[PDB]
Design a protein around this ligand. Structure first.
Ligand SMILES: NC(=O)C1=CN([C@@H]2O[C@H](COP(=O)(O)OP(=O)(O)OC[C@H]3O[C@@H](n4cnc5c(N)ncnc54)[C@H](OP(=O)(O)O)[C@@H]3O)[C@@H](O)[C@H]2O)C=CC1
Ligand SMILES: NC(=O)C1=CN([C@@H]2O[C@H](COP(=O)(O)OP(=O)(O)OC[C@H]3O[C@@H](n4cnc5c(N)ncnc54)[C@H](OP(=O)(O)O)[C@@H]3O)[C@@H](O)[C@H]2O)C=CC1
Ligand SMILES: NC(=O)C1=CN([C@@H]2O[C@H](COP(=O)(O)OP(=O)(O)OC[C@H]3O[C@@H](n4cnc5c(N)ncnc54)[C@H](OP(=O)(O)O)[C@@H]3O)[C@@H](O)[C@H]2O)C=CC1
Ligand SMILES: NC(=O)C1=CN([C@@H]2O[C@H](COP(=O)(O)OP(=O)(O)OC[C@H]3O[C@@H](n4cnc5c(N)ncnc54)[C@H](OP(=O)(O)O)[C@@H]3O)[C@@H](O)[C@H]2O)C=CC1
Ligand SMILES: Nc1nc2c(ncn2[C@@H]2O[C@H](COP(=O)(O)OP(=O)(O)O)[C@@H](O)[C@H]2O)c(=O)[nH]1
Ligand SMILES: Nc1nc2c(ncn2[C@@H]2O[C@H](COP(=O)(O)OP(=O)(O)O)[C@@H](O)[C@H]2O)c(=O)[nH]1
Ligand SMILES: Nc1nc2c(ncn2[C@@H]2O[C@H](COP(=O)(O)OP(=O)(O)O)[C@@H](O)[C@H]2O)c(=O)[nH]1
Ligand SMILES: Nc1nc2c(ncn2[C@@H]2O[C@H](COP(=O)(O)OP(=O)(O)O)[C@@H](O)[C@H]2O)c(=O)[nH]1
Lengths: 331, 334, 334, 331
C-alpha cells in the first residue's frame, strides 16, 4: 500500500486530498499542530488508514522524525499560514512557515533519502498569489510580482522546490493552483465569508455583510477537483510545475450577484463596504492558463463557477438553518 | 480604564481571566494564532463591542509581540501562551521549548524594550507551573527545588528563571505564578480530568463504552481555573513583584478522580476503564501538592471550589454535552 | 550628522561602505555577531572615537534588530548581512534562508514598526545579488526573470520581493541593489577570485605548490567592492526608491581570471591548477553579465576599476601577504 | 577508531578537547559556523583525523545531517554564545543557541539512535554560572539562581539533558564546569582581558586598563585540564553530572595582584573603573566542590591559580612583544 504524508492535513485541501488518496488505497499520515481546542473539524468524519502526528513546519526535528518513522512514498506540503490579509499582520511568522518551512521539509526529505536510500515524490502547494500584479492570463512561466508577505514567501518556497529538483534530482513538483473553494473553505476567505453570511441573512440571524474590494477578480475552482491534480502530477514520469485553474475569472461583485440572486435576494440590500478589509497592496486580477495541466495530466475542472457558488450557498444555508434552531431552542 | 494584554487568550485560563478582568472594568486585548479552523470557542460568547480585542501574533515571532505591545500600550501583560501538554512535549520538544521557554523571553524582552523606548510602566505575569517541581517530593512551596521530568517542565523552569532575572536585573514588575493543576468545563480534552468527564458523559448516554487511561496512581493538587485567574491578577496589584504558589494544598490520585466522577453518576469506573501503556509518559511526575501559605498570607487568596465540587461541576457540564451529542447522533447529524 | 545603521558591517562590503559613509560625515553604527574569535579584521583599522559604533545583534533575532533601531534612530539602514556563500548554502540551506530571506523581512518589519511607533522616516537598502538571475541568460537587467540555482539565490529572491512589497504596500523608501559580483583585497578567501590570488601569492613565494579549483568556464561580471558601495549610497539619495543593477557589463571566465593573475607574475597557471570535483556546485550558474544602464542614467554611477586593474590590485595585495607569511614561516612563527 | 563530534570546536574548550581526543586516537569531527572572516584561529595548527563541517545550533537540520553522516560514538556540545555580559544584549539569540540549541542536538542524537539503532554518548557543557547568586561552595545539587539570560539558558540545557537521560536512558552527562581559562581564552573575558592588556602595557603599547567589578570572586582553572574531565565522564559505566573546579576562589583584584606583580608592576597605576563593565545582575562568588569528580572520575586539577595566571601572562607578553615589533617595523 502506498504511503502518503500530508502536511496541512487539517486544512481545506488536506481534508479533500485525504479522502481522495484513501479512495485510491493509500495509507495516509498527516502532521497536525497541537491546539488548545479541537482542530480536526474537517477530518473527524474520516478519522488504521489515516494516522495523525504532532509536528510543526517551524520545527525541523519534528518533520524529519515523522518522515523517518513513516517512510512515505509521497509527501504533500500543504501546510501554511494561508491568508493574505493576515500575512501583513504576522509577516515574520508567515515567512517562517510558508517559505523556510517548505525548505525544512525539502531538506528533511532529501536527508531521509540519502540516509535511507529510499525514493520519495514531493508536492509543493504553490499559489497564483505568486503572480501578484502581473496581468492575466497567468501560465507557468508568467513573471512573479508578489503583493504580500504570504505571496513573496510562496515565491520563495516555489524556488526552493525548483532548486531541489534541479540540484538534487528530487522528484518535486510545484502545483501553481489558483483560488479554490468549497463548503470547507476558511470563513475568513471572501467566498466562504459571503456564503456563510448569506445563509445567516436568509434565516434572519444576520442583517449586514461587511466587505472590502468588490472589484477584485479571481479564477475560482472547487477544492475537491484540484486535489486530484496534485496527485496526478506525482504520477508522471518526470517532475514539473503546473498551473491548475478554471481559466475563467469573476469579480467578488459577480460572486455576490450569483450567490444572493440564487436565494432571491439583492446583495445591495445587505452589503456595506468597510475599508478595514482592503489590503495594503491588492492583487487585481488572476486568471489561469491551465493548458499544460490539461495536455500533460489530462486534468480538467468538473465544477464550474456558478455550480461552485451554489454548492457553497446550499451548504451554508443548511448550516444557518441548524443555527436558527439552536438560537431559537434556547441554545 | 486599565489595559491588559493576554497571550494565550484562547486557552482555558485566558478565557476565565478575560471574563474576570472585563468584570473589573479592563479593556482586554488578546493575541491569537491564525488557524485554518475557528480557535475562539472558549471566548466567542465574550467577544459577542470594544472591550475585548483580538490580534494575530505568535510567541515564536518576536516582531509580532513588540508590534502589538507598541500599539496597545498595555498596563498589565499576562503570558499564558504555551504548548501546555506534558505528553505532547515529548513528541515536539523543540517547538515546545521555542514557545514555552524562549517565547517567554521574547515577550519579556519586547516589554522591556517597549518600556525603555516609551518610558511607560508595565506589570508582567508569567504562567509558571507545578510541573517545574517534577519528581521533587511534596509539599512543594516557592523554595522547593525544581527537578523537571519533561521538555515542557524544563521549558517552564527556563521561563521562570528568565522572568526572575528580568525582575532582578532590570527592576521589571514581573511575577511568576507557580500554579498547580487547575481544571474546568473548558479544560482541554487531552488532559486527564477532562478526558475522564468527557468520556463519562458519553458512557452514561451510551455513546461510548470504554475509557482508556495510563497511570492511575499519579497524584495531583486540582483546583478550579476560575478561582486561579483571580490569583494572577492579585499578584500584579501588590506593592512589589514576587513569585507565588497557587494551589488547594490537597492531593488526589487519578483513581480517586474516577471514583468521585463515575460514582456521582451511579457507575463503577472499573466496568469501563482499561489501561493502555501508550498513555504512560517516558518520565512520570508522581505527586504534586502545593503549599500556598504565601499566597494566602500576602494576596489573601484562597480557593473557593473544592475537589468534589470541581469534579461534579465538570461531570455535570460534560453530561449535558453528551446528551446534546446523543440527540445529534440519533438524528443523523453526527 | 546623518546616522547610518549597517548590518553585515564586518563583511567585505560593510567595511568599504563604513569608510565611504564616514568620509561623507556620517555617524555609522554596525551590528555584529558575537564570536569566540575576533571578527572585526576588516574594520579594526577604522574603529581605531564616536563616529563608528558596533553593537551585538543577529538577523535571526528580531528583538535585537528592533532594540538597536530604537536606540540608534538611523536615517539610513543598509542590510548587507548574509550567509553570502553559494556553495555553503547547499550545506546549510535552512540557516541560510533564515538569515538571507526571513532575516531581511525581520529588519524590514523592525524598521516599519519603528517608523510607525516613532513617526520617524528611514531610508532602506537591501543587498540584492545577480545570483538571483541564476540560469537566466545574459545580459541581465532589472526586468530579467529570476531562475535561482541555489538556496542562497532563492533566499535573495525572497528578500528582494519582501523589500519591493514593503515599498509598494507601505511606501517605505526601500531600494534593492542588484549588484553583480564584486571583489577586493578584503574578499572572503572562499570565493573564487580571492582563493586564486591568495594561492597565487603563496605559490609565488614557495609556500604553496597546487591550486585546486572546480568549474573554470563559469563566467562572471566582476567589479571592485569599493566602487559598488558608492552605488548603494546613491540609491538612497534619489527622490524616490527603486531597484538598480550595479555591474561592469563585462564578463570573464574563471579561466581568464587565472590567465591574467598568474600571467601578471610571470607564471603559467596550468602548471599549478588541478580540478577537484568537490568544488563543483549541485546546480551551476553559467554566465552573469549585467546591464547597468539604469544606474548610469539615474544615479550617474559608473565603475572606476576595470577587470585587469581589479585582478592586479588583488594579486599585489595577496603577494605582499604571502611575503609576510614566508618570513614568519621561515622564522618559525607560523 | 572511536569517533567524536564536537560542537563549538573553534572555541577555547573545543580546541583543547580536539588535541586531547586526537592524542587518544580518536577521529574528530567539528561543527563550525560559516563566517565572513577566518574563524579557525585556535585549531588551524591541528588542521584525515580532524574534519570540519558547516552547521549551526539554531539549524536542527544541519545537526541531524552531520550526525547521520558521521555516526559519532561521542558527542560533546560545547557550542554557545558563552559571554555573560553579551547575553544581556542578545538574550533571544543566546537562548536559542544555549537552551534550545542544546535540545535540538539532544533530539537529533535521540532521533539518530532510534532510526539507526546506534549508541551515542553525550556531554553537555554546563556552567557554574547556573548557580548564580546561590552562595558557595557549590556542588552538584546546589540550587540554581541564574543571574543572566546566558545562565538561565544553561540551566535550561542542563535540565533538558537530565530529562533525556531519565526519560530515554540516553547516556548524557552534564559537566558543571567552573570558570576555566588559558592563553586561548576569549579576550572579552576578564582574565584574558587583563593578561592581554598587561602584556601591551609592559611593552609600551597600552597605558590604561578599564575594568568593572574587581570584587567578584571566581574559581579559575586551566581549560587544558578541564577537557580531560569531559572525556572521563563519558568513560564511566553510567551517565551522571559532575562539578569540575579547583575549589579555590579568588577575586578579580587578586588576579590583578598576581599578574601585574609578576612583571614587577603595580596594577593600580594602570587600572581604571568603567561602570559600563558592570553587569545588570552580578554573580558575586563562585567556588566549586569537586569531591564527586575526584572520587568517581579520579580527576584533579594540575594547574593551580598562580600557575594559570602566570601561564597566561607569559603567553600574552610574548604576543605583545611581537606586536611591538610590527607596530615599530612600520606594520
Ligand atoms: N486554497 C487556495 O485557494 C489556495 C491555497 N494554496 C495553498 O495550498 C495549501 C492548502 O490551502 P488550504 O487548505 O486552503 O489552507 P488552510 O488554511 O485551510 O490550511 C492550512 C493548513 O496548514 C496548517 N498549518 C499552518 N501553519 C502550520 C505550521 N506552522 N505547522 C504545521 N502546519 C501548519 C494548518 O493547521 P491548522 O489547522 O492548525 O491551522 C492547516 O492544516 C496552503 O499551503 C495554501 O497556502 C495555494 C493556492 C490557492
Ligand atoms: N492549566 C494548568 O493546570 C496549568 C497550566 N499552566 C500554564 O498556564 C497557561 C495557561 O494554561 P491553560 O489555559 O490550561 O492552557 P491551554 O493549552 O488551554 O492554552 C494555551 C494557550 O496558548 C496559546 N498558544 C500556544 N502556542 C502558542 C504560540 N506559539 N503563540 C501564541 N499562542 C500560543 C494557545 O492557542 P491555541 O488556542 O491556538 O492553541 C492557547 O491560547 C499555560 O502557559 C500553561 O502551560 C500552569 C500551571 C498548571
Ligand atoms: N560580494 C558580492 O559579490 C556580492 C554580494 N552580495 C551580498 O551583499 C552583501 C555583502 O556581501 P559581502 O560583504 O561580500 O559579504 P560577506 O560574507 O563578506 O559579509 C557578510 C556579513 O554578514 C554578516 N552576517 C552573516 N550572518 C549574519 C547573521 N545571522 N546576523 C548578522 N550578521 C550576519 C557577516 O558577519 P560575520 O563576519 O560574523 O560572518 C558579515 O558581516 C551580502 O548580503 C551578500 O550576500 C550581493 C551581490 C554580490
Ligand atoms: N569557559 C568557561 O569558563 C566556561 C564555559 N562554559 C561553556 O563551555 C562551552 C565552551 O566554552 P568556551 O570554549 O570558553 O567558549 P567559546 O566562546 O570560546 O566558544 C564557543 C563555541 O561555540 C560556537 N558557537 C556559538 N554559537 C554557535 C551557533 N549558533 N552554532 C554553532 N556553534 C556556535 C563558537 O563558534 P564561533 O567561533 O563561530 O563563535 C565556538 O566554537 C560553552 O558552552 C560555554 O558556554 C561552561 C562553564 C565555564
Ligand atoms: N478575505 C476577504 N477578502 C475580501 C473581502 N472583501 C473583498 N475581498 C477581496 O477578495 C479577494 C479574495 O480574497 P481572499 O478570499 O482572502 O483570497 P486571496 O485571493 O487569497 O486574497 C481579494 O482581492 C480581497 O481583497 C473581505 O471582506 N474579506
Ligand atoms: N493526559 C493524560 N494523563 C493521564 C492519563 N492516564 C493517566 N494520566 C496521568 O494523569 C496525570 C495528569 O496528566 P495531565 O492531566 O495530562 O496533566 P499534567 O499534570 O500537566 O501532566 C499524569 O500523571 C498523567 O500521566 C491519560 O490517558 N491522559
Ligand atoms: N568558490 C569557488 N568557486 C569556484 C571554484 N572553482 C570554480 N568556481 C566557480 O567560480 C564561480 C564564482 O564562484 P564564487 O566566487 O564562489 O561566487 P558566486 O558567483 O557567488 O558563486 C562559480 O561558477 C564557481 O562554481 C572554487 O574552487 N571555489
Ligand atoms: N568580562 C569582564 N568581566 C569583568 C570586567 N571587570 C570585572 N569583571 C567581572 O569579572 C567576573 C568574571 O567575568 P567573565 O570573565 O566575563 O566571566 P563570567 O564568570 O562567565 O562572567 C564577573 O563578575 C565580571 O563582572 C571586565 O572588564 N570584563
Amino acid at each position: 500500500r502506498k504511503i502518503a504524508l500530508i502536511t496541512g492535513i487539517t486544512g481545506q485541501d488536506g481534508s479533500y486530498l485525504t479522502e481522495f488518496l484513501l479512495g485510491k488505497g493509500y495509507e495516509v499520515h498527516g502532521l497536525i499542530r497541537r491546539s488548545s481546542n479541537f482542530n480536526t473539524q474537517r477530518i473527524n468524519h474520516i478519522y488504521a488508514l489515516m494516522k495523525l502526528h504532532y509536528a510543526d513546519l517551524t520545527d525541523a526535528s519534528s518533520l524529519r522524525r515523522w518522515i523517518d518513522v513513516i517512510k512515505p512514498d509521497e509527501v504533500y506540503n500543504l501546510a501554511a499560514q494561508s491568508h493574505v490579509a493576515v500575512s501583513f499582520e504576522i509577516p515574520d511568522y508567515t515567512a517562517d512557515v510558508v517559505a523556510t518551512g517548505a525548505l525544512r521539509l525539502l531538506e528533511a526529505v532529501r536527508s531521509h533519502t540519502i540516509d535511507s536510500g529510499r525514493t520519495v515524490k514531493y508536492y509543493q502547494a504553490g499559489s497564483s498569489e505568486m503572480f501578484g500584479s502581473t496581468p492575466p492570463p497567468q501560465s507557468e512561466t508568467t513573471p512573479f510580482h508578489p503583493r504580500s508577505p504570504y505571496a513573496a514567501s510562496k515565491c520563495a518556497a516555489h524556488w526552493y522546490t525548483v532548486n531541489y529538483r534541479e540540484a538534487y534530482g528530487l522528484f518535486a513538483c510545484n502545483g501553481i493552483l489558483f483560488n479554490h473553494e468549497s463548503p470547507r473553505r476558511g470563513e475568513n476567505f471572501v467566498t466562504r465569508k459571503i456564503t456563510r453570511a448569506l445563509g445567516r441573512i436568509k434565516v434572519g440571524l444576520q442583517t449586514k455583510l461587511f466587505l472590502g474590494n468588490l472589484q477584485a477578480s479571481r479564477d475560482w475552482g472547487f477544492a475537491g477537483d484540484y486535489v486530484e491534480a496534485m496527485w496526478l502530477m506525482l504520477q508522471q514520469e518526470k517532475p514539473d510545475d503546473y498551473v491548475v485553474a478554471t481559466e475563467e475569472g469573476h469579480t467578488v461583485e459577480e460572486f455576490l450577484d450569483v450567490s444572493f440572486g440564487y436565494l432571491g435576494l439583492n446583495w445591495k440590500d445587505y452589503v456595506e463596504i468597510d475599508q478595514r478589509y482592503f489590503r495594503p497592496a491588492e492583487v487585481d486580477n488572476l486568471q489561469g492558463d491551465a493548458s499544460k495541466a490539461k495536455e500533460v495530466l489530462g486534468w480538467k475542472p468538473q465544477v464550474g463557477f456558478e455550480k461552485l457558488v451554489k454548492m457553497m450557498v446550499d451548504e451554508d444555508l443548511e448550516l444557518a438553518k441548524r443555527e436558527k434552531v439552536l438560537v431559537d431552542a434556547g441554545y
